[PDB]
Each structure stands twice: as C-alpha cells, then as structure tokens.
Amino acid sequence: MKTVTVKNLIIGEGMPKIIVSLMGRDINSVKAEALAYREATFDILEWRVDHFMDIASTQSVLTAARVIRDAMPDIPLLFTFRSAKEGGEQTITTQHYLTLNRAAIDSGLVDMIDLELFTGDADVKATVDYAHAHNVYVVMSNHDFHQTPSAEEMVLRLRKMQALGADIPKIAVMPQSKHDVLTLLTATLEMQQHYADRPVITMSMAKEGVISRLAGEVFGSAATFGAVKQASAPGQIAVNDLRSVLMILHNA
Ligand SMILES: O=C(O)[C@@]1(O)C[C@@H](O)[C@H](O)[C@@H]2O[C@@H]21
C-alpha cells in the first residue's frame, strides 16, 4: 500500500509519524505510564509488552491493553513484544509469542502488531494473514544492537518482510562509526525509491544515528521514535525536540 491509514493517521506521506514506547513492568505501572503519556504529543503508541513481567498470563496482558485503552481509547496502538536477542527485556517460546499476538489481534484493542522477521517464515506469514483477516496491520521488524549490516543485506531483509506481507517493514541497526549511519540512510532511500511498494521505518540507533530519526522525510523512513521520559532504545530524543525538528524540515 502507498500509505497505511490507521485511525486518522496516514503513514507514508507528509512528516514522519512520531511513535513513543510505553514500558510498564506490571498493571499499576502500565496505568501510570498511560496517564503520563496522554500529556505528550505523538502519533502512535507502541506498547513494549516485553517490559511486562507477567508475560505468561495472556489475560494479564489483555487486561493491561484494556487499561491503556481506558486511558487512550482511540490513539493508534502498536503491540510489540521485543525478544531479548533483538533488544528486549525477556524471551518467550515461539508458541507463546504467536499466542500473545493472536490474542492482541482478537482483542479489538490493537491497530498494529510488531512481528520479528527471524521468528521464522511459516510462523510469520501465518500471523500476518491472521492479522489481515482481522483488519490489523503488521510492522515486521529486525534489530541489530551490535553492528550495521551492508546496505544490500538491509535492503534484502526489508524486501523479505515485504514478500511475507508486512504492511510496514522496519529495521533498527547500531552504528559503530558515522559511515554506518550513511549506510542505513542509503539502504532506506533505495527502499523508498526502488525496492519498496509500501512504507518502511528505519533507524540507526545511538547518538551517531540521531540524524536518521530526524531525516525520514528526506531519505524515506515513514515513522520515528521519540522518548516521553525514558528511551526504549539508544538515540531516541525528547519527543517535543523530535517534533520541532520534523516540523522545521517539513517547512524548510
Ligand atoms: O527506536 C528504536 O531504536 C527501536 O529499537 C525501539 C523499539 O521500541 C521499537 O519497536 C522500534 O524497534 C525500534
């Protein structure tokens, strides 16, 4: 799709959309964070479910989703379990990971889910098709918190997500140099101009990669993450400062 419309939001045109991550270890924490987040300005709420420390209970997770909706009933909601090996707080079985995403989809509470590409092709393609049958969008994702792959590897990774039916391919990579930031910006622009028929989200993390979080309108990332009080990955800046920069670039 040229653009992904979610609620009142067009992803893939105009200024990149601003995502913040909500991180709560229990239901009381999730409630407090949701009430604090609704006094910040952003386009999409990501719920980082891997920070929730009663992950074994599917209904506990759904109860926490309902509290987020009690506080922010309408905001586009992205449900993300991030595995430890890709930057997250814990590891679950493949079966439970698919059960949590199926429950999220079935709840009617969530607009998008995050699926990690390296979960495995048959499992990812099934959850994509399930999401789509329930009018839920899929951000398919991959993360490297240690290094930056070649531009060719990043393009082919994003293309494989597209091939598996991802609405919005996403990749986050860690620069070890400033040249690595250019590699990520080059891959991004190759997707937007040539290899993608849908929006992509991309970022080079850490301080060196901050420009990648600001320059989406230029090089073709459709969304960008900011911090309300606490970053969910290195390089996220204050969401008001992020908004300031996006508006200056949009307006020249
Ligand atoms: O902004 C980043 O660098 C992230 O690692 C944060 C994640 O919470 C989020 O799901 C996006 O994977 C990106």
Residue numbers in the entry: 1 to 252
Tell me, in the authors' exact words, what the paper reports.
Despite having a reactive electrophilic warhead, compound 8 proved to be a reversible competitive inhibitor of the enzyme and was very stable in the enzyme active site, as evidenced by resolution of the crystal structure of the Salmonella typhi DHQ1 enzyme in complex with 8 at 1.55 Å. The crystal structure of St-DHQ1 in complex with epoxide 8 crystallized with one molecule in the asymmetric unit and was solved at a resolution of 1.55 Å. The calculated maps revealed clear high electron density for the ligand molecule 8, which binds to the active site via a salt bridge between its C1 carboxylate group and the guanidinium group of the conserved R213, along with a network of attractive hydrogen-bonding interactions with several side-chain residues. Thus, the hydrogen bond between the C5 hydroxyl group in 8 and the carboxylate group of E46 is 0.3 Å longer than in the St-DHQ1/6 adduct, while the interaction with residue R48 is shortened by 0.2 Å. In addition, residue K170 shows a bent arrangement, and its ɛ-amino group is located pointing towards the carboxylate group of D114 (3.1 Å) and the structural water molecule (3.1 Å). The unsuitable orientation of the oxirane functional group within the cyclic compound might justify the lack of covalent modification observed experimentally.
Several studies have identified the enzyme type I dehydroquinase (DHQ1, 3-dehydroquinate dehydratase, EC 4.2.1.10) as a promising target for anti-virulence drug development.
